[PDB]
């Protein structure tokens, strides 16, 4: 019922179609604890696109880290999702991706970037709703964010992703 329609409306409200996405994560302290406790290690973000009919993507974050960054870092990953127009798109996904943790003093943003590994299952045409997430396990030391600084303000953080559109 209205629950499924409300859900669709929510996704539409967050979608962008220019490869630029800003994900505001509220209730930081709580979600942060849920991660540290091991109850909810990760969180997926709403979907966004490279163009009106481009690739469908989303972000995946671990407030207390994943893999090599477990317990010491904020881990941030990129996710290629099964899009409505994947049949018209070139595969594997090969666009540069830039990830950022925004400094709310607008000073020192945490930034990193990578170009896809064309041979990884993470960038092949999706068979499932989401491909394996790929990105930065050591994106940012917990001490750098969470702790203090201007990354966490009014119990929220902002993550930004920029997908280069060269060739698209």
């Amino acid at each position: 019922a209205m629950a499924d329609l409300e859900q669709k409306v929510l996704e539409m409200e967050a979608s962008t179609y220019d490869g630029v996405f800003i994900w505001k994560i509220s209730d930081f302290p709580r979600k942060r604890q849920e991660a540290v406790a091991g109850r909810i290690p990760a969180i997926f973000s709403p979907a966004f696109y490279t163009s009106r009919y481009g690739y469908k993507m989303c972000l995946r974050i671990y407030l207390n880290g994943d893999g090599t960054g477990r317990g010491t870092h904020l881990s941030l990953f990129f996710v290629v999702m099964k899009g409505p127009n994947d049949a018209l798109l070139r595969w594997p996904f090969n666009q540069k991706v830039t990830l950022m943790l925004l400094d709310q003093n607008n000073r020192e943003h945490v930034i990193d970037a990578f170009r896809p590994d064309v041979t990884s299952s993470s960038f092949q045409r999706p068979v499932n709703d989401m491909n394996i997430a790929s990105g930065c396990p050591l994106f940012c030391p917990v001490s750098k964010m969470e702790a203090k600084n201007s990354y966490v303000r009014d119990d929220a953080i902002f993550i930004k992703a920029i997908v280069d559109l060269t060739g698209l």
Binding site: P41, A42, R60, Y62, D66, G67, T68, S75, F77, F78, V97, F114, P116, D117, S120, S122, M130, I132, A133, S134, G135, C136, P137
Partner: peptide, 7 residues
């Protein structure tokens, strides 16, 4: 890029 471990 490196893949996540539990997805």
């Amino acid at each position: 890029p490196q893949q996540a471990t539990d997805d």
